[PDB]
Amino acid sequence: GLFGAIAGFIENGWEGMVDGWYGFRHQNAQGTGQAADYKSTQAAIDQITGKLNRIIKKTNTEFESIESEFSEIDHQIGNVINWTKDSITDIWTYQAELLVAMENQHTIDMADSEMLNLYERVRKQLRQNAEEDGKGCFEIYHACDDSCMESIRNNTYNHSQYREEALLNRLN
């Protein structure tokens, strides 16, 4: 896709993650865990809600009848009405088809961009203490306990604390 994460470098989704749209899975000495990210999930939901509020809506124009259900119309005017209504129906069918196709494309790519933005945020936090594996994970070159993992998810991880240890392990 456009931003290369969803159905891209991230191989697949997680069916187990029912408490959010995007999140973290980790592995440290204490074990493994899963945690959704609220800000990215909310950013995607809010944008989709915005679309629904604009799209799930009808005009306030009041129309009245120009075609008699229980009686014959005039021949000349009846052909004009049929031509006009079919022309209008072709326009609305086309516009609806384009609307939904265009919106679906943007929704899919928007969701992709939020996955990437979370990935980039984490990359930039970890600085020189981790490396990308190419599958959406970061291999962290120092011990990172449940507090340390929490700080990465919380956006309060300070790289300079672990830098000397990380660089020694990275350079070997």
Partner: protein, 319 residues
């Protein structure tokens, strides 16, 4: 080393949607934008409405037997039905489509007496088996079939004048009798040359009864054709006639505006709706619908599509 992995959710059963580049794109969730279901019911909650039944709108102005409960009233929504009876005695209205639309656009009818009276040589109580009321021969309630008191005699030269004393325009209707045969014509109006002229400030016309052979409609070969005009406030309309006029005893006043509905569905006062069609009501929040191109009110737009699914989620990439 330790590891932190980033990912996104997925579901077991995803939904297919169309994008700009892909006809079969699987996403986590989607929602319909084209309404397919209709409520087989005219939802009339919050509307002062009038179900006409077997009464035709034009029958309200002339007073057909089926329309006796609908001769006056007020409403914001008027409901017409299939095979509604306008004419008991066979005939037609000139400029009928426009008249029906004016009635279905209105929000009520009021009736005003013309005050038309007739000399003793005129019988103004002509009736027919076609227009039955209370098990007996009758006529259109807002009109009078004028015939000669004595059979065969010349119907007298008569003038009738309606003045609109009101501040709003009034709708006046009258009929012209076109006899089946020369025998019928002479029995009712005499052997003289018949002529009917109608004249106001904004309208002028003349009419001649026409004898001619025709097939029988509900037993009768004769015809009563209706004509109509609008009498402006303070204007008068003068009828000059010597046989053949079906004269108004009252005129109509159309009041305000209302929504005209043509449908076969039954009324329901337990639900409110802003969109109606032949089959019933459309209570959807969706922008489009595929039920019918013929709708009235505040409606979603008609599209030639079974379904258009709007994505409400990311690409579904299951495990």
């Amino acid at each position: 080393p330790d590891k932190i992995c980033l990912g996104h959710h997925a579901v077991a059963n995803g939904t297919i949607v169309k994008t700009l580049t892909n006809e079969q794109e699987e996403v986590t969730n989607a929602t319909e934008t084209v309404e397919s279901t209709s409520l087989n019911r005219l939802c009339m909650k919050g509307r002062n409405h009038k179900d006409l039944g077997n009464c035709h709108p034009i029958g309200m102005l002339i007073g057909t037997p089926a329309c006796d409960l609908h001769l006056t009233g007020t409403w914001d929504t008027l409901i017409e039905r299939k095979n509604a009876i306008a004419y008991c005695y066979p005939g037609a209205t000139v400029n009928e489509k426009a008249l029906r639309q004016k009635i279905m656009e209105s929000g009520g009818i009021s009736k005003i007496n013309t005050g038309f009276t007739y000399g003793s040589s005129i019988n103004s109580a002509g009736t027919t088996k076609a227009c039955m009321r209370n098990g007996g021969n009758s006529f259109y309630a807002e009109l009078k079939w004028l015939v000669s008191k004595n059979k065969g005699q010349n119907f007298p030269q008569t003038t009738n004048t309606y003045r609109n004393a009101d501040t709003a325009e009034h709708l006046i209707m009258w009929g012209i009798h076109h006899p089946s045969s020369t025998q019928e014509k002479n029995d009712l109006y005499g052997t003289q040359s018949l002529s009917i002229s109608v004249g106001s400030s904004t309208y002028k016309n003349s009419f001649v009864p026409v004898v001619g052979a025709r097939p029988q409609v509900n037993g009768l070969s004769g015809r009563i054709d209706f004509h109509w005009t609008l009498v402006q406030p303070g204007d008068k309309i003068i009828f000059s006639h010597n046989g053949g006029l079906i004269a108004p005893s009252r005129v109509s006043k159309l009041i305000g505006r209302g929504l005209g509905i043509q449908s076969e569905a039954p009324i329901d006062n337990s639900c409110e709706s802003k969109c109606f069609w032949r089959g019933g009501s459309i209570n959807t929040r969706l922008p489009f619908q595929n039920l019918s191109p013929r709708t009235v009110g505040q409606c979603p737009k008609y599209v030639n599509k079974k379904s258009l699914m709007l994505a409400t989620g990311m690409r579904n990439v299951p495990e």
